[PDB]
Amino acid sequence: KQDIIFAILKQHAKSGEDIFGDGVLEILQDGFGFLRSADSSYLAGPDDIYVSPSQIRRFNLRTGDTISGKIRPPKEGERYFALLKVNEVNFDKPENARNKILFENLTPLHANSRLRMERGNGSTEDLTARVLDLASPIGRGQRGLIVAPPKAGKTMLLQNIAQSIAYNHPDCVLMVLLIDERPEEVTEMQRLVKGEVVASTFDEPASRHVQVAEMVIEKAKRLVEHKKDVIILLDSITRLARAYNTVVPASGKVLTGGVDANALHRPKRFFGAARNVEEGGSLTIIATALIDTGSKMDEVIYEEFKGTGNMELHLSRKIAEKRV
Amino acid sequence: KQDIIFAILKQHAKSGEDIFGDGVLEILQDGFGFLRSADSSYLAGPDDIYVSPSQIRRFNLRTGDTISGKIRPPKEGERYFALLKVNEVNFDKPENARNKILFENLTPLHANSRLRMERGNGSTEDLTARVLDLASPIGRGQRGLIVAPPKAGKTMLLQNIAQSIAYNHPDCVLMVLLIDERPEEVTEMQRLVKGEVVASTFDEPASRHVQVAEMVIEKAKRLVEHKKDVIILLDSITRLARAYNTVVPASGKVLTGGVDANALHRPKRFFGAARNVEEGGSLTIIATALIDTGSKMDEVIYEEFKGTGNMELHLSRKIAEKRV
Amino acid sequence: KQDIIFAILKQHAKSGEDIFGDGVLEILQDGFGFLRSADSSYLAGPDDIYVSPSQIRRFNLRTGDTISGKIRPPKEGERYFALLKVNEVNFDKPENARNKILFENLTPLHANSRLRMERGNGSTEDLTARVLDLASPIGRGQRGLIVAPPKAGKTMLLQNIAQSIAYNHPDCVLMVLLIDERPEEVTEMQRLVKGEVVASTFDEPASRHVQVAEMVIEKAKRLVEHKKDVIILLDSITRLARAYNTVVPASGKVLTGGVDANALHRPKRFFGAARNVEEGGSLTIIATALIDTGSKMDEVIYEEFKGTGNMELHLSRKIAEKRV
Amino acid sequence: KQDIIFAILKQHAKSGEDIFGDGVLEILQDGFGFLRSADSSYLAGPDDIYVSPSQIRRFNLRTGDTISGKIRPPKEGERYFALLKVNEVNFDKPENARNKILFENLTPLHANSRLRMERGNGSTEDLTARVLDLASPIGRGQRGLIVAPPKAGKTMLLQNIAQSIAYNHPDCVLMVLLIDERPEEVTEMQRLVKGEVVASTFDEPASRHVQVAEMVIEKAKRLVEHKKDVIILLDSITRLARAYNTVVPASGKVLTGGVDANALHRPKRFFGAARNVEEGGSLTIIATALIDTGSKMDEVIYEEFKGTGNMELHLSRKIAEKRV
Amino acid sequence: KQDIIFAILKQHAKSGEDIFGDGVLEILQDGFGFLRSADSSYLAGPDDIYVSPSQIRRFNLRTGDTISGKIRPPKEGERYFALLKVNEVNFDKPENARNKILFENLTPLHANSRLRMERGNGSTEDLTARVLDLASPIGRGQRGLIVAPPKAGKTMLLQNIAQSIAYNHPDCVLMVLLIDERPEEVTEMQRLVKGEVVASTFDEPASRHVQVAEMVIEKAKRLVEHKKDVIILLDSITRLARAYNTVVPASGKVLTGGVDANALHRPKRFFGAARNVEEGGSLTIIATALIDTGSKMDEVIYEEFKGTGNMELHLSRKIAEKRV
Amino acid sequence: KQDIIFAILKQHAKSGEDIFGDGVLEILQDGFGFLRSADSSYLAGPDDIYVSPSQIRRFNLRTGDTISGKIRPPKEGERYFALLKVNEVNFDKPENARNKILFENLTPLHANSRLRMERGNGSTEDLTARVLDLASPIGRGQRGLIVAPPKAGKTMLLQNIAQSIAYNHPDCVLMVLLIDERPEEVTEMQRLVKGEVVASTFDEPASRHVQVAEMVIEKAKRLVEHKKDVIILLDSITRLARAYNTVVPASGKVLTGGVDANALHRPKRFFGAARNVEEGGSLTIIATALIDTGSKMDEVIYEEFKGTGNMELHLSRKIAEKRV
RNA sequence: UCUCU
RNA sequence: UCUCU
RNA sequence: UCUCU
């Protein structure tokens, strides 16, 4: 059905302008970018609209903008549908990106020093009610860490966490980001939640894992800039870190296990993106960290993030025993 | 027999269009490959059909295509017979390879997410029937993983699995794959099942193991592309993974226990290839994990694959001595 | 507010010599730098004053100079406002920076050599008064080191130290420095003390931590050069050292536990900077050592600094649980 | 006596052709080869006949051919006696190497999957009668592994093994290959056996160890091609592996201990050469592996070969105690 | 006061020759050297007299000569006061360096094989009387090693050792060399001893540590050449070794811990400089080695020097317990 | 004495052919060397005879040749005296070095293969007589190995061995070699035996130890070439091996415990050089193995040499304390 | 397996 | 120290 | 933690 689209849009070049295409821009290492679609978890498609590095310079465009606009069929020598012109960069906001403050220049409101070491034992119904204090319109903008051993009831919980955030807070947009995960884990999570679920399977390369996470966080950063409240429910901060380890070029130093010291800064940055702004809006990131995985690498990631959050809970060792 | 077959086809220059020799495609780094026969496990010998970078673009040929076609005897400056024209692939015309859906673009239907760990109940029917549960109409297109210590009668089971499949589902395509194994264990398997067996012996280089597995998973995908149900029975992902590790370009320098982080992607991708398609066809991989071999890798490589399948079977640890 | 301030100074082209904007100097690798403001912890943003390699030779400018001067709006080909002339540094003329003694050339008076190890007597006055013993007239210009395990109320103490200094000695310049810390722990500190607080958050790169610390120790030295008494309260030399380690050019290859041997010099130099001058002024550094973080480095880096100060304070090991 | 030979053959260039010289060809990394003599265990001698890379291309010559032929004295600029012409490449077989099948194209007959874990305790007279089932005209073509700890009676056994193979099977040609071994161990073994004994002492370089083994196995490969039955009695597969480790250029990866993953493939190949052929003839390789040697490297080699053979025996721990 | 000197000597170029300057020459990696002053522990000063590599060739000058001589103000393009001419290279000895034997060509008188394992327990008054047998006009020219654990009373002892050498042997010149040491440790040691004390603080770089030690030993070597008796009291041979590790360019091999095998030779050479000469004079080096420091690196240095001396004492474990 | 001997030979230009100065040869990398004297342990000094690449071809000179010949005073452009002509080597003419059998070409007679491990019966006659068993007519040309822990009176024994040899067999050439040892232990040995002692001190570089050992084993071989019986008594193969390891070009990267695999060949070759010749002469090496020094290498290097000799002597482990 | 007044 | 119905 | 008749 992909080759059929190309023939329809090319011979329809008798009217001039009526081909609209959207997505979210990704800017690449060279300078140019692409518009990417959400349905396929932002996968590099042939029906992805190309974006010039020049329009990037024209519309102050940063990777993560929800660009909807006019396109034109590809000219010989090329491969993809270019961005012919621009219509709507976001909501009712004009093509102008020069009238709103950049995420990183917004004024943050801080909680307090106190790290909240919340209890890990109880029914998954209770534990969720503990983390949901980061989802309530009061406690938004916080960094939550869920420390999770194997077989400890994580998946069951995160679903419940996600499910109840959507059903209890339809006021704010939730993005469940899964990483390096079982395909069925994802589709179960997809059907379980009305909102947006973005994930990359274990057979996807680290190249993908990083990009797909880079996408959600910048998209988050952006929706905040429009005074919307966001929640990232990131499954496996440790797993994303592992990808970031293998993507950043070898600086020349490696800490214990095998992890480059330089590699940790990217996921750190992800976690530190969570804030509440005086200007209006919030990003709140509840991440999970895998522990005692039989890999010495994961322990280092943990011990590096150990108490960087606002609250964290170490889950249960009873569901790790009972199997109910 | 090698330097006499050349003499027949060079003397058959009077009668044009007559030489037949079906061989499955390979493609090398440059943008060209050759054709191979299944009886020899796709080995590189003298009498192989040469494929030009010429024909690859027109017929949209890709690694592991079941290519039958006409051949011309080697003109000087060459070393192999040359591909002259193209007959079929398996059913319709060669130009149909332009208008056929790519495997990666096939929409997969997704099953229930449950670990489904099974106990070592005794190497008999009770064990082989629960793997046939992945062969039964209901649960096709899944990733089976068999954990196995040294001397737990895995081959005894693995034969018995292969035999069951072959004598139960004629519509199904069995494709037993063995990597870095003893020469005798292969001969036994080759005669034990009337289906398709491809294997690389232990006295062979890493290059070969990878190549053989590549050639399978590629063929397997093509067979799915024609709405057919396919099952990979692979012996030792550990071996395959271990191979890849020495083949993959030495980069990153991040060695976690013994394996560079960039290696594990290729076996993971090989494994995650398994799926069930809504449009038609099945691909379901049963693979074994070598355990307690006393190698730093085999452990680490297992820890990486542990619980990535939709079922896992542990072949009797400590209970492997109960001789009843 | 960033692209409107440009518009004011470009329209103020009629009235010559009128634009004021005091910023403390930085110098990069080439032989040039910019000017920075203390409220933002000396960050690299758009509205910063550009310093030419031109003015650096005449006024003998060096990294961390408290420079106030006239500025001209950016001519094209640039990106920043340009430094036009020079007003003051803090007291006399800018040409006095030629005939002022260099910090490294100041003759230091030397105190009594005694380890002066103190016990964890309880986090109250009894603890904070013995650090004030390094702030009292008698024992100025010394290297204080606070050993601290996880959760020993160090910040509680560290605030209390900073507060004591600030409400006791108005003649003294407090300069609380935090490296790679949580965003909330910094805000608290910034409001807790009316003095000077500079900090880098954890979600920031190594580059930044080093840079921030550089900017402090440099400023601190200049303040001594004007016969003033200065106190550095630094949180985590461990963090600073850990940072430097990833910043410092990857050479030597000699990794003793996790840290290259060439790294530890920069934090050691930072620490040993503390001194008391016969000519006038004090520089006394209180710094904390993170312990039992379960990182191979944090240990090694402590073993290197252990007993390099003229006093060391261990904040309650195993006794940290006595909640009275 | 070496310089005396040169004067005799040079002034005897008045008749033309009557200087015959033999040996076994070694083909080198460049392309050319040399004919080498068996008396000195195939050592690079000045009285080694040079072989052109062109005759290598003319007579399908592969390293290991027992070439007997006419030679001529060296011409200025050269150093060695060249191969003037060719007479007999092997037995009564003409100069032609184009009429017989290459070793690797011969049809193998396989034993069965079952690895024969044979008992290690008893008099060396018994243990030998256990391994000699690989030397009997029925059980030929097998891979035998003798796993041997230090002081466990290996040398005493191997002699007995060798001695009885020659005295009980004069029908087939036996090659005892020793490696990295005591000089007197070798000369004792030489005088002990009527057949061919090829060895390299511990003071020989790895360069030699590999070559000398490469020679025996290719010579083996070749005699099989002439329908003769061969037995390699290789002392220390682990020791040969150690040399192969240090000869193959650094691929860029090292497994536990220090051994490159790539390095193991060569000795693997040696072991896998053993077969019985439908065409007539056999190669049977009984190798020994050293274990618990105080070197972690040897354990990896072992665990890599662990059960690659057809039968293996772990020797005795009683002669390792008694000293009789 | 440094810039004031330059104006006095430049306008005093109306008389020609009357500016005398001294020091001790350091020859650098390029070829040239500098005259350096003892008051600042041989620090690279702007008022250091430059020495041409040509005069180095004229007066057989080796790094460490106590050169006193005429100088001239710097010419444009330069930076420092050059060596205009030469007056006195040492004592009453003429400018000639061609009339006295080089240190390394002097005839040594040897003690005997017997290493004197002297007792480590007793009052520091006793222990000192044990080491002082290396300071008595009979026992001079010996290599002494003081093996010292932490908190074991080293500093207290070395002071006493030094103090009593100066007060009991004013006949010979003593150089206390401290390395990588607390600033107050040094100034306490300075005021404590009438003789020469040369040290580098812990905040000095390894660049300095090596140079400052290189200086004392060559100066030692030189005073011996003039028939004077010398004693080096080197604090921390292990600490100097650590610097030598990080200064010598990476040879490509590292022993256990992190120390390059090549790195140890320099401190070895230092220790081996101690001798008594038939020609008259002595160098005796009493060094200390740090042990059980929590760094695996220091143990290797120790075990490398273990019993290279003539006598050594392992200090006390009772002052390591009592604190008196 | 160095710059006056030059003056005598330059003034002896009137009388041609008169200057004598016997020195044993060395050869460097290029294809040239110098001449050396035995009293100074073959050191590189000013007054050494220069050997041209010219004379090396004609007289077939090789490293360690006992060369006596005429010399001419240094013409300008040089640095050393030049070799003018050649007198003798030891017996006949220099042109006889063309028609003399090379050491490596000498046919060795081989003795009985028995481990011959001896117990530590007490350091007296009973110990030194069993090493004299390798010096007695019957068992010449063997590899003796003395295992020795710290402080087991090895030197006491080693002297006693050397003394026995020297006062028993005047026909035999003793050649005591010490590597990386204390300066006093050497002087003692030099006077203790009237034979030949060559040694390198500990305060010397690896280069030197190797060089000294090279110079010995070479000389030793030449002495055998003249049908003479030679004995090497070497102190610490461990030291020699350790040296080589840092000298040998850093390649392979395969470090097994601490030593690169390419290193151990040079000491092994040094050791295996020992042999008995049918034609005439003996070469028998007694060498010591340093044990329990607490170095990762010394162990590994011993494990490599363990049981490579035809006898091994362990000097009292745990029984070294029985002081009777 | 960094919880926990 | 991979034995072993 | 290389002491020690």
Side-chain angles (χ1 to χ4, degrees), chain D residues 26 36-45 48 177-180 198-201 203-215 240 243-244 246-247, chain F residues 265:
Chain D
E26 193 212 335
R36 305 208 191 279
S37 60
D39 71 321
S40 60
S41 280
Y42 313 115
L43 191 87
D48 286 1
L177 174 62
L178 311 160
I179 266 152
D180 208 346
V198 201
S200 56
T201 48
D203 56 303
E204 300 266 21
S207 321
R208 180 93 168 102
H209 294 118
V210 166
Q211 190 225 52
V212 88
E214 286 273 11
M215 214 73 195
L240 174 56
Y244 267 126
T246 79
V247 163
Chain F
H265 180 246

Side-chain angles (χ1 to χ4, degrees), chain A residues 50-100:
Chain A
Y50 165 77
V51 185
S52 56
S54 60
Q55 279 166 322
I56 299 307
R57 292 164 82 258
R58 168 80 92 180
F59 311 101
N60 208 299
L61 294 176
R62 198 179 165 111
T63 166
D65 289 316
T66 315
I67 298 279
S68 312
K70 295 172 185 185
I71 73 154
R72 72 157 175 82
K75 287 198 179 83
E76 302 134 31
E78 285 188 321
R79 201 179 277 186
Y80 305 96
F81 297 80
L83 202 72
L84 170 80
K85 218 169 193 68
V86 181
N87 284 342
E88 303 180 345
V89 180
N90 283 121
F91 295 85
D92 294 334
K93 192 71 184 64
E95 45 212 294
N96 309 325
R98 288 174 178 174
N99 293 117
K100 282 191 180 288

Side-chain angles (χ1 to χ4, degrees), chain A residues 116 118-120 124 127-128 130-132 134 142-149 152-155 157-158 161-162 165 231-238 271 285-291 302 305 307-316:
Chain A
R116 286 191 308 280
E118 224 129 52
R119 287 172 274 105
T124 39
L127 318 172
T128 190
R130 312 277 172 193
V131 330
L132 225 66
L134 308 173
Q142 296 205 45
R143 302 178 311 275
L145 195 66
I146 296 91
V147 183
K154 164 179 63 84
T155 305
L157 170 76
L158 279 188
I161 310 270
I165 282 162
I231 292 169
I232 308 294
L233 203 147
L234 164 60
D235 169 69
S236 51
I237 215 279
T238 59
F271 206 64
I285 298 162
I286 62 170
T288 69
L290 306 188
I291 200 163
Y302 169 75
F305 281 92
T308 54
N310 289 102
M311 74 95 243
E312 60 172 70
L313 70 158
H314 296 138
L315 280 209
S316 37

Side-chain angles (χ1 to χ4, degrees), chain C residues 16 23 45 54 60 65 67 69 76 133 145-146 150 160 182 196 200 274:
Chain C
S54 155
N60 209 303
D65 263 313
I67 304 166
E76 290 155 300
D133 201 12
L145 182 61
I146 313 160
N160 207 237
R182 281 161 78 243
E196 190 180 327
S200 60

Side-chain angles (χ1 to χ4, degrees), chain F residues 172-233:
Chain F
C172 248
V173 174
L174 191 67
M175 202 164 285
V176 179
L177 169 55
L178 319 170
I179 281 146
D180 201 53
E181 185 61 280
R182 281 161 78 243
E184 21 282 285
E185 290 184 63
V186 173
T187 309
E188 182 152 307
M189 186 67 81
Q190 280 185 356
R191 296 176 195 196
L192 218 281
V193 184
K194 196 190 169 71
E196 190 180 327
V197 176
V198 190
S200 60
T201 37
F202 79 95
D203 51 292
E204 287 193 300
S207 324
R208 181 88 168 108
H209 309 306
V210 173
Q211 179 219 12
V212 173
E214 302 273 20
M215 285 297 301
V216 166
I217 204 80
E218 292 298 282
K219 179 183 179 163
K221 283 170 184 191
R222 221 74 48 253
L223 268 290
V224 176
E225 288 169 17
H226 292 68
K227 297 178 185 181
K228 283 287 283 291
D229 311 314
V230 193
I231 309 165
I232 296 312
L233 220 324

Side-chain angles (χ1 to χ4, degrees), chain F residues 2-266:
Chain F
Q2 291 184 156
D3 297 320
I4 309 299
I5 257 78
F6 153 78
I8 303 170
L9 309 193
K10 203 74 186 173
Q11 271 283 325
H12 203 67
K14 192 181 176 70
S15 179
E17 195 194 52
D18 212 293
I19 323 291
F20 291 99
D22 55 283
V24 174
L25 178 73
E26 198 186 356
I27 303 172
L28 307 161
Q29 268 280 132
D30 295 43
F32 81 107
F34 299 92
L35 302 190
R36 321 221 150 323
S37 61
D39 55 295
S40 58
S41 281
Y42 321 108
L43 188 64
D47 39 53
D48 274 329
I49 305 98
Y50 167 74
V51 158
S52 53
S54 155
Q55 287 151 312
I56 295 162
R57 283 197 81 251
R58 189 92 84 183
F59 319 108
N60 209 303
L61 310 166
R62 223 162 203 98
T63 322
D65 263 313
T66 325
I67 304 166
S68 311
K70 315 281 176 167
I71 54 273
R72 64 170 174 92
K75 279 184 176 73
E76 290 155 300
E78 302 177 53
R79 202 170 283 101
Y80 300 87
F81 300 83
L83 201 83
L84 186 84
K85 210 182 177 68
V86 198
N87 271 346
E88 304 169 53
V89 175
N90 31 37
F91 290 94
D92 277 48
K93 283 196 174 184
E95 294 187 322
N96 197 279
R98 157 77 84 166
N99 281 17
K100 271 279 178 290
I101 334 96
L102 216 165
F103 180 85
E104 314 290 332
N105 294 320
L106 264 53
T107 51
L109 289 173
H110 297 272
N112 297 354
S113 61
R114 278 161 184 170
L115 257 164
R116 207 182 300 158
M117 47 179 72
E118 307 273 358
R119 297 175 188 177
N121 308 113
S123 66
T124 179
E125 293 177 41
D126 294 308
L127 215 53
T128 57
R130 291 176 192 178
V131 188
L132 275 155
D133 201 12
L134 307 198
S136 62
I138 311 158
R140 279 196 173 102
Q142 288 182 320
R143 297 176 311 276
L145 182 61
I146 313 160
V147 178
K151 295 171 186 178
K154 74 163 203 300
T155 40
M156 311 292 98
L157 163 143
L158 220 61
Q159 282 167 107
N160 207 237
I161 303 287
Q163 180 72 325
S164 297
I165 312 301
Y167 218 86
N168 286 35
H169 305 270
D171 47 77
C172 248
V173 174
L174 191 67
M175 202 164 285
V176 179
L177 169 55
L178 319 170
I179 281 146
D180 201 53
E181 185 61 280
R182 281 161 78 243
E184 21 282 285
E185 290 184 63
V186 173
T187 309
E188 182 152 307
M189 186 67 81
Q190 280 185 356
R191 296 176 195 196
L192 218 281
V193 184
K194 196 190 169 71
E196 190 180 327
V197 176
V198 190
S200 60
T201 37
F202 79 95
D203 51 292
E204 287 193 300
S207 324
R208 181 88 168 108
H209 309 306
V210 173
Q211 179 219 12
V212 173
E214 302 273 20
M215 285 297 301
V216 166
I217 204 80
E218 292 298 282
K219 179 183 179 163
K221 283 170 184 191
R222 221 74 48 253
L223 268 290
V224 176
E225 288 169 17
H226 292 68
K227 297 178 185 181
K228 283 287 283 291
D229 311 314
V230 193
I231 309 165
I232 296 312
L233 220 324
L234 184 150
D235 194 359
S236 196
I237 257 186
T238 303
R239 253 43 201 71
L240 177 53
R242 212 206 285 221
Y244 269 121
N245 168 241
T246 95
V247 175
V248 159
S251 287
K253 208 180 195 173
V254 173
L255 307 167
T256 21
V259 46
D260 70 291
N262 208 28
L264 291 148
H265 180 246
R266 281 281 213 273

